[PDB]
Amino acid sequence: TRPANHRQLTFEEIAKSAKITVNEVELLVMKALSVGLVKGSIDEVDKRVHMTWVQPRVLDLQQIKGMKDRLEFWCTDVKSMEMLVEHQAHDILT
Amino acid sequence: MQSGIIHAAEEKDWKTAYSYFYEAFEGYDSIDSPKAITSLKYMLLCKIMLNTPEDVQALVSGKLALRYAGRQTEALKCVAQASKNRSLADFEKALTDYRAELRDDPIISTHLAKLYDNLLEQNLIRVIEPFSRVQIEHISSLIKLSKADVERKLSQMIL
Amino acid sequence: MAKYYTRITMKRMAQLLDLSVDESEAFLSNLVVNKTIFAKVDRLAGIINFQRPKDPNNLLNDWSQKLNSLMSLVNKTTHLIAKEEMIHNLQ
Amino acid sequence: AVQKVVVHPLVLLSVVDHFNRIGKVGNQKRVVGVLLGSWQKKVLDVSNSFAVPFDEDDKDDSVWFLDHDYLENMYGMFKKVNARERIVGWYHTGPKLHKNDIAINELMKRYCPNSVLVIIDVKPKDLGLPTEAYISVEEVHDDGTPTSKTFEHVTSEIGAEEAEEVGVEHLLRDIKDTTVGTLSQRITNQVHGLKGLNSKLLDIRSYLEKVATGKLPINHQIIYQLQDVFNLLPDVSLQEFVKAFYLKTNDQMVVVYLASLIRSVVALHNLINNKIANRDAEKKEG
Amino acid sequence: QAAELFLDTVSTFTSYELMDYKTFVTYTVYVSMIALERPDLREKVIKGAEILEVLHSLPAVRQYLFSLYECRYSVFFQSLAVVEQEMKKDWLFAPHYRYYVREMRIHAYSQLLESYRSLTLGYMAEAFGVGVEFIDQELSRFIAAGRLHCKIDKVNEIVETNRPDSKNWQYQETIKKGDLLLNRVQKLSRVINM
Amino acid sequence: MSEKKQPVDEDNWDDDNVEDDFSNQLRAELEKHGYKMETS
Amino acid sequence: YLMEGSYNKVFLAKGNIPAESYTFFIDILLDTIRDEIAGCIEKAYEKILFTEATRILFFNTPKKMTDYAKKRGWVLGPNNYYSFASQQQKPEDTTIPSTELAKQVIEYARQLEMIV
Amino acid sequence: AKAIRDGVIEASINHEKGYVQSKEMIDIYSTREPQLAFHQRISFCLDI
C-alpha cells in the first residue's frame, strides 16, 4: 500500500494494525525476513524499518489502469530526453 | 657478544646488533654453555626489542634451542607471550614472577620504560578500537589507570 | 543482529543476551578486534550499530546495478508477451 | 543450459538465396532448413546450413513434410566434406512464429538434443537485430497442464570470424562509420539505444491492450515482473544520490580540465614548429 | 626544499663560508621547524646525536626547539621574539623574517588548537601566552586569513574547531595554478603570431 | 619594430603577500608581550 | 547613503533639507523606503516585539501596521513578529543539471572531434 | 540586513538578544559550482 515515496513504517503502526505488543513485532519481522517474503532493514532506536522489496501479489483489471498511467508519462520522459539527443547531437553524425 | 653490546647500548642497529649476538651464540655452540645460555637472552630480548614477538617462539621451538632449555628462556617466552597478547599487566606479572632472572642485568634494567611506552600504547590502541564518542572515565576503568595521565597521553597521541 | 539490525541501543541487545551491558561489551570487543563482526559501539547514548561505512562509491555503483537488473527485467517480459499473443491470435 | 548463440553472415545469406530460389511460389512458403554447427563451452555456434523442401497448406495447418532422405544424404555429404561440422538445430524463415514450429522441433529432436530453431528476417527493417533463436522448454505448472513445451528466446548475436571478415568487409566498400572517438558511442547507443528502450517500452503498452477488449488470459504470470519494475523504479534526486553525483562529476571534470589544458599547449608547440618552417623558408627560397 | 638540501649535516664540513658548523646547525633547525611536521621532528632532530651534540652548546636554540616540542608555549614566544629579532638583524633572513614568524605563530596555533574542540579563548592567555585581546585579533586575522581551521564564538567566550576535507583546499591551489598557466599561455599566445 | 603609436602620453611576490596580510600590523611586535605580562 | 545599509542617516537627511523644500522628491523617498523595508522586513528576523521594527520606519500603531502586517506576513500577534522561514523546497535538483549539463557535454563533444 | 539582501551572509541575527549567530556552512565540494568554474574554462581552453 505504501508508495515509493516512503514505504517506511513504524512499530507503533504495527502495534496498531496487528494489535500485537511492542516486544513481539521484532521477532515477527525478523521471521518475515528469515522466510524472505519481504526484504528490508531494521532500525531499533527510531522504531522504524526500511522495507524495500515485497512479495509480489495479484491484481484485477483496475490496477492495470494505474500501471498504464505510470507507463504513460514514462514514455514521454524517454521522448523528451531523447529529443535533446536527436536535436543537439544532429551535426555530429547525419 | 660485545660487538652487539655497545650497538645495543646506543640502540642504532638492532638488526646487525642482533646478528652479532647470533654469531656469538653460533661460536658458543656446544663448547661454552654458560655464555651460550646467556647469549639466548641478548638475541631474544633484541627481538622483542625489535617488536617481532612470534619469532622468539619460532627460535626456541627450534631444535638448536630445545637443547638449551632453562628458566631464562622461559622468562623470554613469557615476555614474548606478553607482547604477543599486548597488555600491560601481562608483562608486569612476567617481571614479577621471573624478577630473579629478568631483573638481573645492568643494561636489561634500562629497557623497560620504552617497552612500557610501546606496550602502553599497544594495549591502548587495542582498547580504543571498537567505539565512538566515549568517556575517559570508562577508559580509565578498562585500562585501570588514572585519568590525568591517560588524558595527557592520549593528547600526545593526537598531537 | 549484524545481519538485520542497522542500529540498536545498549539495552535491547543486552536484554536479548540476558546478561550485563558490561559483559555485552566484552562480547562485542573480542569479535571486532577479531574483526569478524564490524561494529561501532557507543557508551554515552548506547547507540550501537553494524556495517556502517561512508560509501562514496557503492551508492551510485549499486544504483547502476539496479540499472542493469532493470534493463534485463524489461528485457525479460518483452519476448514473453509476443508468444502469448501468438497462442491466441496466430490463425 | 545454452548461454548464447553465434550466427555467421554465410548462413545469414544462405537462408536468403534459398528464399530467392523458392521466390517464384509467391503465395506462401516458409523457408525451413537444417541448421548446422557446433557448440563449445556452452556457447552455441552456427556456421553452415541448407534448406529442406517444405510445403504446407492453410486448411488443416498441421500437415508438414521433411524429406529425411534429403536430410541424411546431404548431411552425410557435409559430414564427408567436413567431419568437424555437424548438426546444431534447425531454422525457419520466421515472420511471426508459425504454428507448426511446436512440433517441427519435436519432429527432429532425435538429431540434436538441444535442437534449436532460428527465426530470421527477409524484409530487413528494425532498430535492433532481426536475428532470433528460441529453445525448447517444458515445465508443468499450477495453471495449465502437462505438455508445456513452450519456446524461450535465448539471447542472440552475430558472431564474426577472421576468415569471413576479409570477404565481408570487401563486400561492403560502401559506408563504414569508423573513426571511433566519442561519436561511435554517441550514435550506436546514446542515439540508438534510447530508441532501443522505446520499443521495449512500447511492447508492454501493446500487451496493455487487454483492459476490457483484448484476449482472455488476464494476469497470473505477467504482473509479478511489472510489479518488480515499478518496485524497481530507482532513487529520486534528494537523499544522497545528488551528493555522490556532484562528488564524482566534480572529480571527472578535473581530468577533463587537465587533458583540455595540455592539448592547446601541444598545438601551440606545433605552431612554433610551423613558424620556424615559414620564416626560414621565405628568405631561403625567395 | 631548503631543509631537504640541508638533510645531512654530517657530510657537511667546517666551511669557509659557514666557518661555524653550529651556525649551519642553527640554519638547518630554523628551516626544519617550518619545513617538516611532528613525525619527522619526533624522529630526525630529536634522536640525532650528531645534531644533538652541537645544540648541546646552544642554550637558547636547544630551548627554542624544546619549547615547541615539549609544549612550553609561553616561553616559546619569548625565544621566538629573540630569534626573530636577530633574524630581523640577519643577512639572508632579513628578506623573510616577517614571513618566518607569521608561519611560526600559525604553526603553534595549529599545534595546540588541533587537539581539542571546546577549548575556550580565556584558557590560552595564562598557559599559552598573555593577552586575551591579542589572541582575539590574532586568531581573527587568521581565520579571516582563511587558514587555521576553527570557528570562534565570541559572546559566550569559547573557541570551536572543525575538520575540513582535503578536497576544497586541494581544489584551491589547482584553480590557482590553472588560472596562472592560463594567463601564461594566453599571454604567449598573443606574443607569437603578431 | 616595437613602435607604440602613442595617443595619450621571485624576490618580490611572496614578500608582497607578506605585505598583503601583514601590511602595517605589529611591525615591532617585540615589547608588546612584555607589556601584556602585567596587564594579562 | 541609499547604496549601503545606511537607514537612520537617511532620516537625518530628512532632518536636513537645506536648499529648498524638496518635498515632492522626499515623499517619493518616503515611498521608496516604504516598499524597501516592507520588502526586507522579510529577513532572518527571529522575533521582534511591537517596538523596534515598529519605530524604525515611520509607524508606531496606526492600522498601517495592519496594512503591512496583513499585506505581507509578520502577523499581528502577542507582541510578536512571526518569523516564518521555510527555504527548503527549491534545492536538490540533479535533473536540471542533468538537462543543462547533458546539453553542455554535447557542447563539449562538438568542439572536440568535429572539424569546423 | 542589506548583507542578507545582497546575500553576503546567510544566518540570523538575534535582534532581540544582540548577538549575531552564523551557521557552519561547509562542503562546497558537493556543489554544482566547481563544475561551473570548470565549465567556464573547459570551452575556453578548447577554444585556444
Curated annotation (Swiss-Prot), chain C:
This is 26S proteasome non-ATPase regulatory subunit 12. The chain holds residues 366 to 456 of 456 of the full protein. The modification N6-acetyllysine is found at K3. Component of the 26S proteasome, a multiprotein complex involved in the ATP-dependent degradation of ubiquitinated proteins. This complex plays a key role in the maintenance of protein homeostasis by removing misfolded or damaged proteins, which could impair cellular functions, and by removing proteins whose functions are no longer required. Therefore, the proteasome participates in numerous cellular processes, including cell cycle progression, apoptosis, or DNA damage repair. It comes from Homo sapiens. The gene is PSMD12. It is linked to Stankiewicz-Isidor syndrome: A neurodevelopmental disorder characterized by delayed psychomotor development, intellectual disability, behavioral disorders, mild dysmorphism, ophthalmologic anomalies, feeding difficulties, deafness, and variable congenital malformations of the cardiac and/or urogenital systems. It comes from the Eukaryota. Component of the 19S proteasome regulatory particle complex. The 26S proteasome consists of a 20S core particle (CP) and two 19S regulatory subunits (RP). The regulatory particle is made of a lid composed of 9 subunits including PSMD12, a base containing 6 ATPases and few additional components. Interacts with ERCC6. Belongs to the proteasome subunit p55 family.
UniProtKB/Swiss-Prot annotation, chain F:
Expressed in limb bud, craniofacial primordia and skin. It is found in: Nucleus. InterPro entries: DSS1_SEM1 (IPR007834). Its main location: nucleus. One of its GO terms (biological process) is proteasome-mediated ubiquitin-dependent protein catabolic process. One of its GO terms (cellular component) is cytosol. The keyword RNA-binding does not apply. Signal peptide: none annotated. Keywords: Nucleus, Proteasome. Component of the 26S proteasome, a multiprotein complex involved in the ATP-dependent degradation of ubiquitinated proteins. This complex plays a key role in the maintenance of protein homeostasis by removing misfolded or damaged proteins, which could impair cellular functions, and by removing proteins whose functions are no longer required. Therefore, the proteasome participates in numerous cellular processes, including cell cycle progression, apoptosis, or DNA damage repair. Belongs to the DSS1/SEM1 family. This is 26S proteasome complex subunit SEM1. It comes from Homo sapiens.
Swiss-Prot record, chain G:
It comes from Homo sapiens (Human). Belongs to the proteasome subunit S14 family. This is 26S proteasome non-ATPase regulatory subunit 8. Component of the 19S proteasome regulatory particle complex. The 26S proteasome consists of a 20S core particle (CP) and two 19S regulatory subunits (RP). The regulatory particle is made of a lid composed of 9 subunits including PSMD8, a base containing 6 ATPases and few additional components. Interacts with DDI2. Interacts with TASOR. Component of the 26S proteasome, a multiprotein complex involved in the ATP-dependent degradation of ubiquitinated proteins. This complex plays a key role in the maintenance of protein homeostasis by removing misfolded or damaged proteins, which could impair cellular functions, and by removing proteins whose functions are no longer required. Therefore, the proteasome participates in numerous cellular processes, including cell cycle progression, apoptosis, or DNA damage repair. The lineage of its organism: Eukaryota, Metazoa, Chordata, Craniata, Vertebrata. There is a cross-link at K63 (Glycyl lysine isopeptide (Lys-Gly) (interchain with G-Cter in SUMO2)).
UniProtKB/Swiss-Prot annotation, chain H:
It comes from the Eukaryota. Component of the 26S proteasome, a multiprotein complex involved in the ATP-dependent degradation of ubiquitinated proteins. This complex plays a key role in the maintenance of protein homeostasis by removing misfolded or damaged proteins, which could impair cellular functions, and by removing proteins whose functions are no longer required. Therefore, the proteasome participates in numerous cellular processes, including cell cycle progression, apoptosis, or DNA damage repair. Component of the 19S proteasome regulatory particle complex. The 26S proteasome consists of a 20S core particle (CP) and two 19S regulatory subunits (RP). The regulatory particle is made of a lid composed of 9 subunits including PSMD3, a base containing 6 ATPases and few additional components. Interacts with UBQLN1 (via ubiquitin-like domain). Interacts with ERCC6. Belongs to the proteasome subunit S3 family. This is 26S proteasome non-ATPase regulatory subunit 3. The chain holds residues 439 to 486 of 534 of the full protein.
